[PDB]
Amino acid sequence: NYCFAGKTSSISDLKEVPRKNITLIRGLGHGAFGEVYEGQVSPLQVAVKTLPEVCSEQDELDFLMEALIISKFNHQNIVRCIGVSLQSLPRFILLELMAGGDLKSFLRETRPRPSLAMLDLLHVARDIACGCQYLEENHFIHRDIAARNCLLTCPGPGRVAKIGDFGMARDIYGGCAMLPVKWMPPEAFMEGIFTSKTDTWSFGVLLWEIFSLGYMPYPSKSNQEVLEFVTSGGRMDPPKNCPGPVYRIMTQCWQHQPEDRPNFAIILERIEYCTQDPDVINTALPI
């Protein structure tokens, strides 16, 4: 079973789509080890996450749980789950298609060159902050807030960013070299403690990813170097051209004591105040 928002659910509640109704159009990218495709359902445009047939039994239940988790969110900044095709092999999860791709790539592919403005970055930040607030309000801890796990509806104007992957929260419902150490607060990678204030810290790092335009956090540092850097009180410098009000949100997210970090209602509040400052949204992005 899986529980969320006071309700417990099982596989039966997922809407099973007859395999005959599903057509694969494109490969779209890889994952930890599974694949994602562009797909049709008779005609609806979907993304299809596939479970390799060459997989263990823990994998089986991992894949099922992810479907249950995503199915019980009802929020515009969290990708929708359209159904499943689990009674045929390979097993499918049908998901909202995000034509903008992942946020990390979009930021790198869109880095102004010989297009974007500060306000577009704030809306992406606001979008993800809105979803995180919905998760916190419902007592869901994502554990892996990061640009690679966010998607965009479209690359152009009017894009909406949404949280698009929940593999981490499913794993705790693989190893040290696989932990997202660069997105985790001290109490997390030191004690294994996880709360909504853990996602708060991660969002601050995501915020740095957004306003660096897709850079890797702690650019020249390794995982262990970041662990010693952060535990000692070290923090990243502002991204190039980052407005103070935006950097000041990152630093509040990175408070050493979780209970000096803001919740996601306050982060939204402060992001919205940033969209209201001309001196912020008129700041030029670096080329």
Ligand SMILES: Cc1cc(-c2cc(C#N)ccc2O[C@@H]2C[C@@H]2c2ccc(F)cc2F)n[nH]1
């Ligand atoms: C669920 C879903 C994926 C997509 C999707 C669309 C396009 C288009 N054009 C290109 C890539 C897409 O995902 C690729 C696998 C990587 C990914 C990143 C972050 C995530 F959070 C989840 C992901 F799968 N649309 N919907």
